Amino acid sequence: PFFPPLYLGGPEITTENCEREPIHIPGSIQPHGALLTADGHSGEVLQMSLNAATFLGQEPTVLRGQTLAALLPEQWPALQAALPPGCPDALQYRATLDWPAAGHLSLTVHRVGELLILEFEPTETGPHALRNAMFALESAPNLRALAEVATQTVRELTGFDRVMLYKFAPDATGEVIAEARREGLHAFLGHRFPASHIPAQARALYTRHLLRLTADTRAAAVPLDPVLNPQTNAPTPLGGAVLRATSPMHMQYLRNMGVGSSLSVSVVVGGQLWGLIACHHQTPYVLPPDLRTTLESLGRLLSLQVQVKEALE
Amino acid sequence: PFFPPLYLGGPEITTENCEREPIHIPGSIQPHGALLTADGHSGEVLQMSLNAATFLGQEPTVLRGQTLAALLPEQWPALQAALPPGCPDALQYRATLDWPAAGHLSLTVHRVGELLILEFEPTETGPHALRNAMFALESAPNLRALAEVATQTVRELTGFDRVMLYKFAPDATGEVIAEARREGLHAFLGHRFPASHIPAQARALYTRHLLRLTADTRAAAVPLDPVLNPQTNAPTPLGGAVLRATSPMHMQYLRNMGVGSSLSVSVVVGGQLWGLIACHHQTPYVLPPDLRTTLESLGRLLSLQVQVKEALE
């Protein structure tokens, strides 16, 4: 069971009490994007990240309380129809928007209960990157080859300095069973780590929401304002949002290992977390949203490939 | 065993001898695109579709014999490295090019032996269209729901007037086991058709090359010039090229049914052709290349979903 978050009086996290960090409701996002929350019926913007004006151009009073119909006239109908009430919180609506700064602005929306959650992030491969990846994965003759091709493909698509396939045992310990990495990196292949390293609430979350990342492992989180959802007077659930602030405890872990940027995709087999495609980069790194989607798609393929090959082997 | 094609003295196809039509080497393409073939080592353009100048702007003598290095300076290195000798003929290199006509020009390249085959077609959704489709497919509780969600998803992505899941029995007859269609269309759900309707050489081809289409079921094919590959003095294999001319026999079948446009993706399970996602539209229709890729990706997911669910059921 969760502690309250730090902003509701909850205690600071330590190595004893880390299984109980409410990692899904940090009340803050990562600084490479902005986030808004809005009413699912009326489209009124209820919360905003304090950096919203940097990405959107409007002010924290000009936005807060306004309707998405007024803010995003072209997207609102399509968005509302894509994410109707009662839908899965994993369902997403994505669109590209123009802004005064060069390039585009990616918008990704999901719904959790009565709330819509809108994530904005800059954008400046595709479906065909994946399509060649599928062939690679499909022709692999055994699980070892599959695991290897999987990590080699992901690294080719992403440029990540380390890409690992991390498989869980029934006791929640994990083993790096395949690894693609930059020449000269110290190898993690075959190493096992304790269950505590990806604690129980994280694993549970990773079964429902299949991709998470830390763009910059020393970047300070940007709070949401107001911190609590006015609909509920409870914390906003950020589990389905990639801009969700990462556990400081995990960021510390990453920095200690010399990791500037991190990303993992879940491999989920029979509704169980089977393992992770776990990636590191030496520097801060923002993976473009369309590459992330591709990775999610690859995770679901690998999950099925694994399920099939494990049944035959 | 195949007849020679019509341009090597082979006989015209009839309802008796249709299992033997060399559908993989028509020596011609569909008119909504252009095609070139080039040497895999030197990049010299060896064959061209007679309509090449319409899509490329150069003349049939200015192109024929020129190197891709000279014609596509930006793509040639990446292309050559993506498709090295000995690779699978299903592997593809895709890029977008600019041209004097509005919009882009899509280039798709594959290699068969010593030959590179370049397909050019106009372009004026994505990876995230697929990503929501995967969720739909994944949550289906049984094969019937899977089949239905599959056809409903494909139709949503494509707008096709009829989308069918067509499952083969061991005798090569097929049954439409799920169907999404425009309101008021006559239903094919549950109907069985004879093995002759998708003859043996077609099924064999569909096991290796997983998507084919007829953009316009009364459009006349555009020949390749020279018709034979100068490397081999034999026909050019067009099995891996979507612009490949469709069997006139099949086009006739389509027109008789009132189908202006057709597309199917293979569902391949344990190296066997399990069925097809088979689509019709009332009018001529060019599906954008990035939507086609997405469909291919969906076919490979459905194949795995089917394999897993059939093992459990």
Ligand SMILES: *C/C=C1/C(=C/c2[nH]c(/C=C3[NH+]=C(/C=C4\NC(=O)C(C=C)=C4C)C(C)=C\3CCC(=O)O)c(CCC(=O)O)c2C)NC(=O)[C@H]1C
């Ligand atoms: C006392 C708490 C601890 C702790 C908490 C923690 N860890 C995560 C998330 C992850 N931990 C991961 C572990 C590894 N990455 C590696 O490279 C290796 C080994 C080579 C390991 C064992 C991983 C992969 C994750 C997933 C996130 C990612 O991909 O970066 C969380 C949850 C983070 C979040 O989602 O906010 C938490 C709370 N880890 C510990 O080691 C102890 C100190």
Ligand SMILES: *C/C=C1/C(=C/c2[nH]c(/C=C3[NH+]=C(/C=C4\NC(=O)C(C=C)=C4C)C(C)=C\3CCC(=O)O)c(CCC(=O)O)c2C)NC(=O)[C@H]1C
């Ligand atoms: C004597 C030869 C015949 C013949 C040849 C033929 N058929 C195909 C390809 C296809 N036939 C298909 C059959 C159907 N489409 C449907 O909608 C239904 C039923 C509702 C059926 C039975 C299909 C789906 C294909 C795949 C191509 C596509 O998706 O359009 C070929 C090969 C075409 C090519 O790839 O060039 C050939 C040679 N069909 C006959 O009925 C007899 C006359």
